[PDB]
Curated annotation (Swiss-Prot):
Organism of origin: Cryphonectria parasitica
Residue span relative to the full protein: 90 to 419 of 419
Catalytic residues (positions): D35, S199
Keyword Coiled coil: no
Coiled coil: none
MF-aspect GO terms: aspartic-type endopeptidase activity
Listed name of the protein: Endothiapepsin
Amino acid sequence: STGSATTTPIDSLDDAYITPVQIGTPAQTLNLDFDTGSSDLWVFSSETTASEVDGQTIYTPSKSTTAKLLSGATWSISYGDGSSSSGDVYTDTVSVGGLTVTGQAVESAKKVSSSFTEDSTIDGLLGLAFSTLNTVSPTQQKTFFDNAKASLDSPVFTADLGYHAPGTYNFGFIDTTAYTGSITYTAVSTKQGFWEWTSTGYAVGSGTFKSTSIDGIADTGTTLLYLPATVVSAYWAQVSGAKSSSSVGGYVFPCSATLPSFTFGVGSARIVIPGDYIDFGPISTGSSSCFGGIQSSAGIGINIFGDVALKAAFVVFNGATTPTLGFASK
């Protein structure tokens, strides 16, 4: 089997991407944030504290003839951005782009943190990291991909995120029309539960390539590119007037600037992030100070190849017995 679904930016800045997901019988379609940096599929629901729901579409398990309470199971998750959610668990039928999993754990939120409430466009998350990170207790549950894997034509999914435009998540096949040149594959460590890999270096604009190993995670659920402070300083030094602002919470730059590109290495291959992808717009409405899309990972504890990086590539998440990651230009 295979599946193919369009993913759409939630706003004009590509702050996140939502993908429609069918849950239950009859189908209830919710728009979920596909997140390769976590491993829970959780949704706003009829069980979510009423004051914490503000415009989201909810899953109502009592209206699904295939929903079953997973007795005694609870979940609770906290993300790197400080947000969180928790609740109980149902199993139900879940379909993405024509690919169906029966008996998928659907984690129903009883509580969500304010950032979730405040984002009316995201109805929940669909985790695509390794199932070892799943938070369900006392019986850990599998991700949608892990459940689907054996049925797929090939044990892979691909992320093809757009810049200020829709893109595609495919399951079970590689669309050879969706990228240019060849796909370069690179090793993955699953030791921390992530799609963790090592970039071979970077360049800023038309500058020379610096060969240096940068360990990080491919994370569709993180907006920006978080890299070591040395790398990030070298980038922003090429933008007149750019500075790190403790009050704003990272590097800002004059909105009048033209940003240089940023290149990252994948083995001997190179992925170029155009400068415009690094612009996240005014820090506040009407401001001439703009927020940068490349930020320091210092104090996160891990480097994160988030959407800023991934949307410059066609990315293969290869879930073979020994997982790997592939990157192509597009």
